[PDB]
Amino acid sequence: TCPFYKKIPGTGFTVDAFQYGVVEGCTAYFLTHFHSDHYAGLSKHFTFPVYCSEITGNLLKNKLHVQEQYIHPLPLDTECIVNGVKVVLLDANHCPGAVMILFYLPNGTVILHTGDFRADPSMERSLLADQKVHMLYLDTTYCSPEYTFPSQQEVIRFAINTAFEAVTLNPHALVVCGTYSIGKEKVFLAIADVLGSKVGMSQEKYKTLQCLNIPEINSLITTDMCSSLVHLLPMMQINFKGLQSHLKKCGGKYNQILAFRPTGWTHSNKFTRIADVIPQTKGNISIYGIPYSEHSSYLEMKRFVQWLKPQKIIPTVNVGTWKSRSTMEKYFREWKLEAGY
Ligand code: NI
């Protein structure tokens, strides 16, 4: 059965609710982004209308084989009418094609559902600026002050400088980057760009990236591994055993691996500046964990919410435990008293 925090009251609508079978009363299923925890349940046999971005719709059609007649892509930043209700999709600063949804209810209530997001001050000048929001369905992934991490730009700077140094020192070093879902493409694209290489990957991953509307993508990626010195592999294989094995397969073209694991937050964030990050090393293989987040930090989330001044907040992440729920509710109250709404 569908939880309450996936239902939009006063509508026939649900958000990211594909794993409950037919939800009673649902006339239209929204999908915020193409991440498995959110799309779980969709397939070629799904027969209800799915509303989403152009990019999520490309992935539904090509990767999950959803039939085209049930895919309803909407433009961003544009007022659209769905089953008689005005809606707007806004960029979520998450993975490619990820959206926030604004719903203008028939009775005058305005609801913002953030999907998964990384809050940014640029959102303060989108269509949110123009009107009041009553209820906020909020991505609370990192809702606790211990969750600090650098900007995406600082992290990419570190990665580019690190890769360029290593390969200029040793022209026979291979760079590997871990992946398991869409998102975080900047990591591997910025590194291949500084090295003058395309990025090499499996056919299944190339197919996924070809759905993303990234400009000049045919220029940046390839399935010919032999021609590339930046390789993508599954995240599970970014360990000393799995990297050793991959190096065997390259046939003596290379004698060293420098690998990157873009994680979210890790506890080494509470002690270490990005500048000071060091790898784990075994022989001719080094592994960097880099804190490239596509969710809000605590301070970014706080700022967004204190700017929006919602009347009610409904968390969508960390809702399973009472300790989590109580922690989150205390921070919402702090924020409201400090800003005075
Ligand atoms: Ni996500």
Side-chain angles (χ1 to χ4, degrees), residues 1-23 25-203 205-215 217-240 242-247 249-269 271-281 283-311 313-341:
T1 67
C2 188
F4 72 106
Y5 68 78
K6 298 187 175 275
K7 286 159 180 209
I8 307 298
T11 64
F13 301 154
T14 58
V15 181
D16 301 346
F18 298 88
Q19 60 167 303
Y20 306 103
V22 186
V23 176
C26 185
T27 62
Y29 291 78
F30 287 78
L31 184 56
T32 61
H33 67 293
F34 194 76
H35 275 167
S36 58
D37 273 6
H38 297 262
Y39 72 70
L42 274 160
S43 62
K44 70 162 70 166
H45 311 292
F46 198 80
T47 37
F48 297 100
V50 181
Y51 287 84
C52 56
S53 69
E54 170 176 10
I55 288 164
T56 295
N58 300 339
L59 291 158
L60 291 182
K61 180 203 167 161
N62 294 284
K63 298 292 294 188
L64 297 179
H65 301 300
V66 182
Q67 305 164 43
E68 195 146 59
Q69 73 179 133
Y70 306 106
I71 307 172
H72 297 265
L74 308 169
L76 300 185
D77 300 323
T78 301
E79 295 177 314
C80 296
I81 306 307
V82 180
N83 297 350
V85 179
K86 178 160 73 171
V87 309
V88 171
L89 304 190
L90 306 164
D91 201 275
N93 192 38
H94 188 53
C95 64
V99 301
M100 315 194 287
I101 314 162
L102 250 201
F103 302 92
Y104 292 79
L105 267 47
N107 69 12
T109 301
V110 181
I111 294 164
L112 176 60
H113 195 301
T114 63
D116 280 351
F117 87 140
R118 189 159 178 180
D120 196 75
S122 66
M123 296 170 174
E124 301 166 21
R125 297 166 282 283
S126 65
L127 313 199
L128 292 175
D130 310 48
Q131 91 292 274
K132 173 182 187 56
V133 171
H134 304 79
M135 312 181 75
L136 178 64
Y137 287 68
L138 179 58
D139 174 11
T140 47
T141 297
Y142 296 125
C143 192
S144 188
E146 75 272 28
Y147 299 120
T148 60
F149 27 74
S151 66
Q152 287 176 171
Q153 191 280 328
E154 286 175 78
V155 178
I156 287 304
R157 178 99 276 204
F158 171 80
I160 287 167
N161 289 352
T162 298
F164 184 75
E165 176 166 328
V167 178
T168 298
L169 294 171
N170 183 191
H172 300 274
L174 174 66
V175 177
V176 179
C177 292
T179 197
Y180 42 32
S181 65
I182 70 172
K184 307 193 187 184
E185 290 82 9
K186 190 72 170 172
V187 183
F188 52 88
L189 298 169
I191 290 166
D193 178 79
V194 83
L195 301 170
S197 180
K198 289 188 178 181
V199 186
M201 64 199 61
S202 74
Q203 294 187 265
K205 192 68 185 178
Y206 185 90
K207 177 179 178 172
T208 302
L209 298 184
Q210 286 295 159
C211 307
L212 303 181
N213 293 348
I214 288 169
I217 198 62
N218 298 327
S219 65
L220 320 163
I221 62 174
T222 188
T223 55
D224 178 7
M225 312 287 290
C226 293
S227 69
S228 149
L229 51 140
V230 178
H231 293 177
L232 310 185
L233 293 183
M235 197 73 88
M236 290 192 73
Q237 187 168 9
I238 307 301
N239 49 69
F240 295 121
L243 297 159
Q244 278 165 215
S245 171
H246 186 67
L247 186 61
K249 295 168 216 133
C250 296
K253 205 161 183 294
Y254 307 112
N255 59 15
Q256 176 189 343
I257 287 189
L258 178 98
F260 292 95
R261 290 180 348 84
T263 67
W265 176 92
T266 57
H267 193 53
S268 53
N269 269 272
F271 310 126
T272 318
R273 285 175 140 61
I274 187 61
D276 297 324
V277 161
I278 66 171
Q280 287 196 233
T281 292
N284 60 347
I285 300 184
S286 294
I287 308 172
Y288 286 91
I290 63 176
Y292 193 96
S293 182
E294 295 185 334
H295 297 274
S296 312
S297 75
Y298 174 82
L299 292 170
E300 297 156 354
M301 185 190 306
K302 181 178 183 284
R303 184 195 164 98
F304 180 81
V305 177
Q306 285 183 312
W307 170 85
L308 192 71
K309 305 185 173 47
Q311 302 185 350
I313 305 172
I314 299 153
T316 64
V317 187
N318 305 312
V319 302
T321 78
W322 302 115
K323 182 189 188 197
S324 279
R325 286 194 156 285
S326 179
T327 294
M328 292 181 296
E329 294 173 338
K330 283 175 31 261
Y331 291 126
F332 312 141
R333 184 58 58 178
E334 295 180 10
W335 300 350
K336 181 175 158 88
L337 298 165
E338 179 187 21
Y341 51 103

Coordinates of all heavy atoms in Angstrom, one line a residue, residues 33-35 38 94-95 116 294-295, ligand 1:
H33 N 12.5 11.5 -11.3 CA 13.8 11.2 -11.9 C 13.9 9.7 -12.1 O 13.3 8.9 -11.3 CB 15.0 11.8 -11.1 CG 15.2 11.3 -9.7 ND1 14.3 11.4 -8.6 CD2 16.3 10.7 -9.2 CE1 14.8 10.9 -7.6 NE2 16.0 10.5 -7.8
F34 N 14.9 9.3 -12.9 CA 15.2 7.9 -13.2 C 16.3 7.3 -12.3 O 17.4 6.9 -12.7 CB 15.6 7.8 -14.7 CG 15.6 6.4 -15.3 CD1 14.4 5.8 -15.6 CD2 16.8 5.7 -15.5 CE1 14.4 4.5 -16.1 CE2 16.8 4.4 -16.0 CZ 15.6 3.8 -16.3
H35 N 15.9 7.1 -11.0 CA 16.7 6.4 -10.0 C 15.8 5.2 -9.5 O 14.6 5.4 -9.3 CB 17.2 7.3 -8.8 CG 18.5 8.0 -9.1 ND1 18.9 9.0 -8.3 CD2 19.4 7.9 -10.1 CE1 20.1 9.5 -8.7 NE2 20.4 8.8 -9.8
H38 N 13.0 5.2 -6.9 CA 11.8 6.0 -7.3 C 11.0 5.4 -8.5 O 9.8 5.5 -8.5 CB 12.4 7.4 -7.7 CG 13.0 8.1 -6.5 ND1 12.3 9.0 -5.8 CD2 14.2 7.9 -5.9 CE1 13.1 9.4 -4.8 NE2 14.2 8.7 -4.8
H94 N 19.7 17.7 -9.3 CA 20.0 16.3 -8.9 C 20.8 15.6 -10.1 O 21.9 16.0 -10.4 CB 18.8 15.6 -8.4 CG 18.9 14.2 -7.8 ND1 19.8 13.9 -6.7 CD2 18.3 13.1 -8.1 CE1 19.7 12.7 -6.4 NE2 18.8 12.1 -7.2
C95 N 20.3 14.5 -10.6 CA 20.8 13.8 -11.9 C 20.1 14.4 -13.1 O 19.2 15.1 -13.0 CB 20.6 12.3 -11.7 SG 18.9 11.8 -11.7
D116 N 14.1 14.3 -5.4 CA 15.5 14.4 -4.9 C 16.1 15.7 -5.5 O 15.9 16.0 -6.6 CB 16.3 13.2 -5.3 CG 16.1 11.9 -4.5 OD1 15.4 11.9 -3.4 OD2 16.8 10.9 -4.8
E294 N 24.9 14.9 -5.0 CA 23.6 15.4 -5.7 C 22.4 15.6 -4.8 O 21.3 15.7 -5.3 CB 23.4 14.7 -7.0 CG 24.5 14.9 -8.1 CD 24.2 14.3 -9.5 OE1 23.5 13.3 -9.5 OE2 24.9 14.7 -10.5
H295 N 22.6 15.6 -3.5 CA 21.7 16.1 -2.5 C 22.2 17.3 -1.7 O 23.4 17.5 -1.4 CB 21.4 14.9 -1.5 CG 20.7 13.7 -2.1 ND1 19.4 13.6 -2.2 CD2 21.3 12.5 -2.4 CE1 19.1 12.4 -2.8 NE2 20.3 11.8 -2.9
Ligands
NI1 NI 17.8 10.1 -6.6

